[PDB]
Amino acid sequence: EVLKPRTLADLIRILHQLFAGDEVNVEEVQAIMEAYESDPTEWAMYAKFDQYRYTRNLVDQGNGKFNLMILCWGEGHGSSIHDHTNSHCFLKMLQGNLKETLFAWPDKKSNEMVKKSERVLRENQCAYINDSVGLHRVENISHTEPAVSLHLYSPPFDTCHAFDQRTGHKNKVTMTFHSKFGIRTP
Ligand SMILES: [Fe+2]
């Protein structure tokens, strides 16, 4: 009964509609992102990897309502523990598998951070997080295979915080794009 996009372009078009309003039904968006069957022929143009770090590849700016980007995780690549700057954040697997570790928020006291959940995102699965849910970190589970994920952030944002797992202390980080619309950035 979920509206099923048949192509990445269908999905983007549906997303333009679901985020046209002031209200966003989170479960609705999650189910539609998940219903799209990852087709590498459709997103290979965005699948630009790097030897040492994961890459952020902009796909669509969602008429100022969201960023839709593709993240390419090389062998063993992972993120830091990070927050999401008060936005809705949807994460769908396109290839491979990411381990998501949910953390609790630190307070002012220095302390080892606390895991609240640990899971593997399956093929085509769409996960969701926001700041009230927790912090998280994502990691390619594989040291022999890449992972590719599709991310929708609403409203868009280009700064967040990274957290040190040993203490909980945090630093501001400016996110950069490795490529936009299939074109490498400077
Ligand atoms: Fe994230």
Curated annotation (Swiss-Prot):
Induction record: In hepatoblastoma Hep-G2 cells, down-regulated by phorbol 12-myristate 13-acetate (PMA).
General function of this protein: Catalyzes the oxidation of cysteine to cysteine sulfinic acid with addition of molecular dioxygen.
Impact reported for Y153F: Almost total loss of enzyme activity and iron incorporation. Reduces zinc incorporation by 20%
Processing and modification events after translation: The thioether cross-link between Cys-89 and Tyr-153 plays a structural role through stabilizing the Fe(2+) ion, and prevents the production of highly damaging free hydroxyl radicals by holding the oxygen radical via hydroxyl hydrogen.
Protein name: Cysteine dioxygenase type 1
Cellular component, GO annotation: cytosol
Binding-site residues for Fe cation, renumbered to this chain: H82, H84, H136
